[PDB]
Design a protein around this ligand. Structure first.
Ligand SMILES: OC[C@H]1O[C@H](O[C@H]2[C@H](O)[C@@H](O)[C@@H](O)O[C@@H]2CO)[C@H](O)[C@@H](O)[C@@H]1O
Lengths: 11, 452
């Protein structure tokens, strides 16, 4: 979720 | 930027580059051509990068397996020696350096890994691998390590992995099956399991590389090592009383070293082709030419009939070749570099404890086959915009596991935003946008800015 919003901003 | 009227040769570091340089000096004042030998790091990946843009060396020296890859990229010029020259070398060693029927390199010598032991520290060498743990705690008492070899390269650890059941690609109907990779079967696990057992018991350091294990054997600190014929000259300098012998056998099965044929390929972008040819044919591949290199670092069994008759009687070549007989010759297909890297990863991760064998090997399977991971195989099918006239972006996945189905080029693809209740993935009312680009590749970046 949180480590996945961070991912999705970069990705 | 690779000039004319001079020869620049690239050989591996551990090989006889100094002996080759002596052949260079002989050639230098025989025709009038400057021959210089370089030995750079990661040479086998440097070449397909520098030469690919017209600027490599004239000649490159590597094991026959890498050449298949290069050949495909057309970095190597195809060599045509008259059939009368091909008689000097053994007929089968020419197959090693054949790709699409084209002869691409000159076979120089055959090297396979052999178990080198210390006759003084250990009088009688171990027949099996299972007895090494037993025969280490014995030597550890007397302030010595039993077995030490380069754990950093797969070429060294693979014989053990291969011993029980492991293999690269299955040879089926005079060819190699690229989907069938046996880097992760029952036998491959048993091999890597027991290898970790040696690390997670302090029998062998998972750090150990080349020069570490190399120096230690020469100082007289380790009982056994696993190395190639090139290694022998440093063991001579140090004056250790040593013996080259057959590798130990794991689970009754003999260890299966992948066997390389050292080869010399001519750079396609080079203008000095015929110059190189006359060097290799007339100067290098001859009794004195091979003697010089062998004087520097032993070549193993050479491919040159005339000189091999001589080398044959050396008891150390006997053991080298006896090891090669138990193992297999390397494939020279391009998928090999994938395989090699696939294993380097696995062995490294398993050694450090980063992964359990089964995990490291499953990834190795994925890597060598070059397929999707178990998690992602379901993207393969997808192509919700298809029967395509023209360029396409093939079904791929991104770094979150969002399938991007096969799309025609120059089109904006839309897929629902992922969301996560802990691990559990689901789809929102929102959309992730990604462009399948005009040239046929997915845009590097996925615009996920709407899933909040
Ligand atoms: O370790 C994987 C590596 O193995 C082979 O390279 C060997 C080479 O054949 C030997 O002559 C010696 O120099 O050691 C090399 C690696 O330590 C493969 O040819 C190569 O593709 C692969 O990277």
């Amino acid at each position: 979720a949180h480590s996945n919003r961070k991912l999705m901003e970069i990705i | 930027k690779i000039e004319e009227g001079k020869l620049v040769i690239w050989i591996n570091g551990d090989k006889g580059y100094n002996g080759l340089a002596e052949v260079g000096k002989k050639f230098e004042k025989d025709t009038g051509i400057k021959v210089t030998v370089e030995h750079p790091d990661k040479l086998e990946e440097k070449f397909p990068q520098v030469a690919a843009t017209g600027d490599g060396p004239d000649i490159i020296f590597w094991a026959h397996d890498r050449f298949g890859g290069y050949a495909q990229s057309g970095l190597l010029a195809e060599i045509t020696p008259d059939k009368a020259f091909q008689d000097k070398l053994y007929p089968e060693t020419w197959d090693a350096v054949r790709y699409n029927g084209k002869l691409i390199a000159y076979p120089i010598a055959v090297e396979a890994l052999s178990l080198i032991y210390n006759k003084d520290l250990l009088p009688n060498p171990p027949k099996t691998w299972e007895e090494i743990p037993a025969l280490d705690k014995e030597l550890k008492a007397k302030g010595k390590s039993a077995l030490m070899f380069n754990l950093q390269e797969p070429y060294f650890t693979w014989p053990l992995i291969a011993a029980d059941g492991g293999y690269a690609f299955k040879y089926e109907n005079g060819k190699y099956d690229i989907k069938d990779v046996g880097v992760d079967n029952a036998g491959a696990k048993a091999g890597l399991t027991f290898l970790v057992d040696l690390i997670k018991n302090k029998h062998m350091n998972a750090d150990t590389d080349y020069s570490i294990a190399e120096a230690a054997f020469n100082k007289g600190e380790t009982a056994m090592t696993i190395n190639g014929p090139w290694a022998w000259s440093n063991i001579d300098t140090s004056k250790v009383n040593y013996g080259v012998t057959v590798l130990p056998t794991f689970k009754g099965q003999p260890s299966k070293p992948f066997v390389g044929v050292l080869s010399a390929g001519i750079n396609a972008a080079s203008p000095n082709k015929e110059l190189a040819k006359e060097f290799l044919e007339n100067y290098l591949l001859t009794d004195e030419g091979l003697e010089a290199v062998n004087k520097d670092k032993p070549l193993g069994a050479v491919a040159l009939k005339s000189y091999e008759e001589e080398l044959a009687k050396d008891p150390r070549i006997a053991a080298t070749m006896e090891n090669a007989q138990k193992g297999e010759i390397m494939p020279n297909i391009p998928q090999m570099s994938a395989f090699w890297y696939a294993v380097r990863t696995a062995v490294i991760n398993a050694a450090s404890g980063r992964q359990t064998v089964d995990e490291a090997l499953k990834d190795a399977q994925t890597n060598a086959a070059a397929e999707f991971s178990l998690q992602d195989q379901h993207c393969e099918s997808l192509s919700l915009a298809s029967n395509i006239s023209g360029l396409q972006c093939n079904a791929s996945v991104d770094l979150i596991g969002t399938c991007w189905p096969r799309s025609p080029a120059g089109q904006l693809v839309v897929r629902p935003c992922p969301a996560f209740f802990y691990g559990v993935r689901y789809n929102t009312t929102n959309n992730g946008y990604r462009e399948c680009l005009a040239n046929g590749s997915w845009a590097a970046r996925v615009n996920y800015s709407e899933c909040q």
